[PDB]
Design a protein around this ligand. Structure first.
Ligand code: 57K
Ligand code: 57K
Lengths: 691, 691
């Protein structure tokens, strides 16, 4: 025992495995539920400081497989795990779910066989994933591993013989490896008969049993670990489309561990903990040369957070847990449950303070969450303090995160107007490679920002099951050679595919000072998914096939300009070229304003390509009731689905509204539905007996 | 008329639009059905030279919208199209479908308003896509366009007035644009009243109608073209998952046209025809400098074929059509129809001649399709002349194409063992940018090859609805810094996602000289999709978590080596370090062979991670009956699905087999099912009345 004379018992001594985990730079597996309790408790303090919490607000039960291989809840002492994979079912009362919400936490035990994945770990992880999926509850994975378990048939090591070319000279080589009849008998004695595949021969009176295949008696040596790896890869891929999946990389994550991080999609990387495929030393051995210095050079946050593999970084394990808990606060308690409403001090009924200007540079986050000024706080479109940005280290041209609109959680996509630089590090394997700095213009989709946009759309849809708002402000895609070669078309197409798959309401809003041109409009038009999408343009937004300069270049040419001087200029109506030379600068501007007068929200309304033109200051009030109304109608459409189109379903639901309700008034419709949920339920139940 | 005195009529004069299309370097739209007839006729000649074709073997009917907007077949003279989008329903008797197969061909008319997409073109394209989808038939798109239609309100051009700052000095600027009461009256006269949005004011007795928004009387000017663009983007995204989709880029393809190429996925690019987003000239205007020289520098085959955007290139339009027709020959006639069997001279019953060797370099295509040698033709695994390679210009480390196995069409994925170089061109926008040459090791998945593998899997599954074979031979993924930074994990994960979605039989086969290690095995294990996947290893293949060198480094260390000399070496059993120094080279090799003896197909069978170990020479005979048996059982499983698991369904089907049939004999099972299809149908019909 060390240290001696401590006020309370030494936990690292009571359970020596706690100390091993600490030595390896991570939280001991059985101490993670405590971090969840701490993080959950902080969630309450930051929400309502006055709240009194008892310990019944949080329950953690370890899940273990029974005799029949069925998962069951147990209360046992930490460190009694027979396998290197552990799980807990957590029930927590949270501000969003005061009566309680559940989730499963699966974790590798880094103290058990270096946190390697053997077949039993692989089968348990899969069983826990299925348990979560069946229940529709979130699956949190805590990665601290060494990848697939590696081994050799240790019993064949002290028994094998080598059939030398020349017994006297071993350096002359060998023909094969074999067993003596004494060796075979050792195996027959210990029942490990099937540990080898032998072909018997006779060489100089001696009977040799030639080793044709070494199998081993111990399970978890090779290909059986790889089968399990593939099994848990498939399971995680499936879970991502079914439940909320998140991973915290808490110590290193290797091989299958790295793939699991990615297949679960949403990931938080603790600083200094690498996500690697093959270690740096092994790569150097393969390369001959000493190319790489460390594993963090390969999979640190400097790589993975900049890649977009890691959605967020965390200073330590508790910060990682706090981030999980915060992310979860926007997510339904279980699959197909409503999005968790959480109204705070910042209510729906207020105008939007922060307003962008054409003449002044801004951070889109100010339009989202507001900004601190010397003269007080300027409120943005969403609730103060509700913006939770993710994928912040990658493709910084698009801003993605979760927010709240009068308590309603949703995913937000905004456009960074400022030029963005990214540093491509120098390739250690190429001596003629130097670090490159890429600069990307604002309001233009590039391969990385198009990929991030599509990724965001998918991560909001799958598991999170959230509505979304896109503050659409793009000039188009980078049409240049480098970006065309870097497959900008491929990533742009993923955006369309993500919108087609979207199952919750979408609001596309061209904000003030915002634009949407040819290429950018195509990829975000509400006709991509009419069932879920609707578009709105601010009165101070612009949209058209080309930018005005482009339109004038194709349709307001010199002949048309001169015919305009020959109409508007008295003096003009070699004596001409002197007049032309003085008028062209202003007559250029006149055509440029003529083109711009077509690019207005009023044209968009006239042509019926947008639902409404809006005033930025009044957007929060409008979107709160439009979103609330939309969630209520969507609920009614889902209930009716228990064989008709959406158009027929919504017509039927709206035929139930009193004759006096204006179908175009969002507040009235939302208010009526909420006042009549049980009445509407009775109606629905009456229709069920009619099918 | 020119030329004069030709033997037959001058078609380019009879229809002047034919000449315009030719001048622009493309086939005239109405002449494409003829290219399909020519290509289809060649298909027959290359199959059976003796066949006699009449003109009834091929029918092409133009599809046009009727009064109610419903598509109908018409016989009219070319060039009578009121819109710039045309379609044909083609019915062709082919070697695979001698009684006929159908498909729709949609094409832009480059002679109609430069092949721009206006709302009517967008609505027609969408109607044709829906027509194809409803019928389950392939949709061929021929791209020859200028993107979304651009325009201005031409009627407001001769009427607008400018409200100058100083009437005498125009160069001093202006305040707004306006209309006179005479201008307003011109609009009122021609009914174009709603062409402008005006706000009336009085300035110096004069009544000015200030232009607040220019709308226009003509449809197809701006945002209405963008709405249609998004509509056809969504439709194509959807079609790709539903029917066989292919695009031939026959003249330039711009903006929405470029996205359509990509959303349809499968594309053939005619040499010299660019796929661009923004033209080179417009980019230069935006850039200030003269950065780009041509549109082919941005979207030529040098870009798109090297990207993998273009699956194939074609010398001219007929070569493009021939490639469509050849690709289609592997595809079912309509959605959910069986894969088209086409038995040729090269029958199933033969061994595989071409065999790879460890000591000798080979082209994987020889293992696939065979090779010509001086001593005659060495047959490969698949039918002679059946390999149709696609994505040949991109990520040349993986070989992807369609082939036939005794007539059965399937998708093939093979590993290029040779080192692959690719040339990244120099960025014209960066003066400090020089062309880079990347070299990639064989048998290693890199970001591009992992992406190509996933892409291949998806393109075989969607629309093509084919079974697949992967000749799995990878050491793993590139774990190095450059490839980790270039998101190798992301692309590796797409492989898993593609396999999870696979709906047809899959065969994973580790070939002779082939390997599958830690990282590579995870992503292709049959437990990712147990319902469709099965794995096989050649007797001369290897598999384990690490390569032998890796295994020895972790589990056969110095203490273990010395304990082996202290057991096997009489002389060994400062007098030691001299012995150690002489024995370590051979004792290294002994441990290296000890590790390798675990990496065998016999271990794979023992541990039950593979279905069977195989002999390469006998693989064609085995896979032909295994695949045939699998297609028959899959058919029966689909019929039974008209509420149980797959395991229950296949148990039921196999309970119908006579007691004497061996469920493990593929040939016997396939033979019995094919002899009893109608008998099994009767059984199925009897069960229907029991639900
Ligand atoms: C002057 C002018 C403009 C546009 C237009 O509408 N653009 C918007 C889309 C872009 C291109 C200009 C901006 N994007 C771009 O790559 O910008 C980078 C900053 C290079 C990354 C593509 C069309 C035309 C046609 N003729 N003259 C035009
Ligand atoms: C010697 C040795 C080998 C392996 C092994 O199994 N590898 C297979 C997978 C690779 C890495 C070596 C090959 N890949 C690679 O990047 O190869 C490039 C050519 C660089 C592109 C990753 C593991 C270990 C562990 N200790 N010592 C090892």
């Amino acid at each position: 025992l060390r240290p001696i004379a401590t006020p309370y018992p030494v936990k690292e001594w009571l359970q020596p495995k706690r100390y091993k985990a600490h030595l390896m730079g991570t939280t001991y597996v059985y101490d993670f539920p405590e971090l969840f309790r701490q993080a959950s408790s902080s969630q309450w303090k930051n929400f309502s400081a006055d709240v009194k919490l008892t310990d019944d607000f949080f329950i953690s039960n370890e899940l273990i497989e029974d005799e029949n291989g069925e998962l069951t809840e147990v209360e046992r002492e930490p460190g009694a795990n027979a396998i290197g994979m552990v799980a807990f079912k957590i029930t927590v009362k949270t501000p969003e779910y005061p009566r309680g919400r559940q989730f499963v936490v699966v974790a590798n035990d880094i103290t058990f066989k270096i946190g390697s994945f053997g077949p039993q770990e692989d089968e348990f992880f899969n069983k826990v994933t299925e348990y979560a999926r069946k229940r529709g509850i979130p699956r949190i994975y805590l990665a601290a591993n060494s990848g697939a378990r590696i081994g050799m048939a240790e019993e064949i090591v002290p028994l094998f013989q080598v059939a030398w070319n020349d017994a006297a000279n071993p350096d002359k080589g060998f023909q094969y490896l074999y067993l003596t009849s004494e060796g075979m008998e050792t195996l027959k004695k210990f029942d490990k008969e099937n540990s080898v595949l032998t072909e018997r021969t006779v060489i100089n009176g001696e009977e040799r049993f030639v080793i044709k295949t070494i199998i081993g008696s111990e399970d978890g040596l090779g290909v059986e670990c790889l089968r399990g790896s593939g099994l848990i890869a498939g399971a995680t891929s499936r879970a991502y489309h079914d439940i909320f999946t998140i991973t915290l990389v808490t110590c290193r994550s290797v091989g299958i561990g790295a793939y699991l991080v990615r297949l679960g999609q949403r990931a938080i990387q603790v600083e200094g903990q690498p996500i690697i495929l093959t270690g740096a030393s092994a790569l150097n051995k393969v390369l001959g040369r000493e190319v790489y210095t460390s594993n963090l050079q390969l999979g640190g946050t400097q790589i993975m957070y900049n890649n977009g593999v890691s959605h967020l970084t965390a200073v330590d394990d508790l910060a990682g847990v706090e981030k999980i808990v915060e992310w979860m606060s926007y997510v339904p308690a279980k699959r197909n449950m409503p999005v968790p409403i959480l109204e705070t001090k910042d209510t729906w009924d207020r105008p939007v303070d922060f307003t962008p200007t054409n003449d002044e540079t801004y951070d889109v986050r100010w339009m989202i969450e507001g900004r601190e000024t010397e003269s007080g706080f300027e409120y943005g479109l969403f609730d103060k303090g509700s913006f939770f940005e993710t994928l912040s280290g990658w493709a910084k041209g698009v801003v993605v995160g979760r927010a709240r609109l009068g308590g309603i959680p949703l995913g937000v996509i905004g456009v960074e107007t400022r030029t963005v630089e990214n540093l491509i590090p120098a390739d250690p394997a190429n001596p003629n490679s130097a670090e490159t700095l890429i600069q990307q213009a604002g309001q233009v989709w590039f391969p990385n920002s198009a990929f991030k946009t599509a990724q965001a759309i998918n991560d909001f849809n799958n598991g999170e099951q959230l509505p979304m708002m896109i503050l659409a402000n793009w000039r188009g895609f980078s049409g240049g050679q480098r970006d065309m070669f870097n497959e900008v078309l491929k990533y742009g197409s993923f955006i369309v595919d993500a919108l087609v798959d979207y199952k919750q309401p979408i609001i596309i809003y061209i904000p003030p000072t915002g634009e949407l041109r040819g290429g950018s409009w195509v990829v975000v038009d509400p006709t991509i998914n009419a069932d879920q999408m609707e578009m709105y343009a601010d009165v101070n937004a612009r949209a058209g096939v080309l930018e005005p300069e482009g339109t004038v270049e194709i349709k307001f040419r010199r002949e048309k300009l001169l015919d305009t001087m020959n109409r508007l200029d008295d003096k003009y109506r070699k004596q001409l070229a002197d007049r032309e030379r003085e008028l062209l600068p202003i007559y250029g501007q006149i055509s440029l304003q003529f083109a711009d007068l077509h690019d207005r929200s009023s044209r968009m309304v006239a042509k019926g390509v947008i639902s409404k033109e809006l005033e930025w200051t009044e957007a929060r009030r409008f979107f709160f009731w439009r979103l609330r109304r939309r969630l209520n109608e969507e609920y009614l459409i889902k209930r009716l689905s228990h064989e008709a189109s959406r158009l027929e379903k919504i017509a039927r639901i709206r035929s139930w509204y009193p004759a006096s309700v204006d179908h175009e008034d969002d507040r009235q419709v939302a208010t009526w539905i909420e006042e009549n949920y049980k009445t509407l339920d009775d109606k629905l139940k009456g229709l069920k007996l009619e099918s």
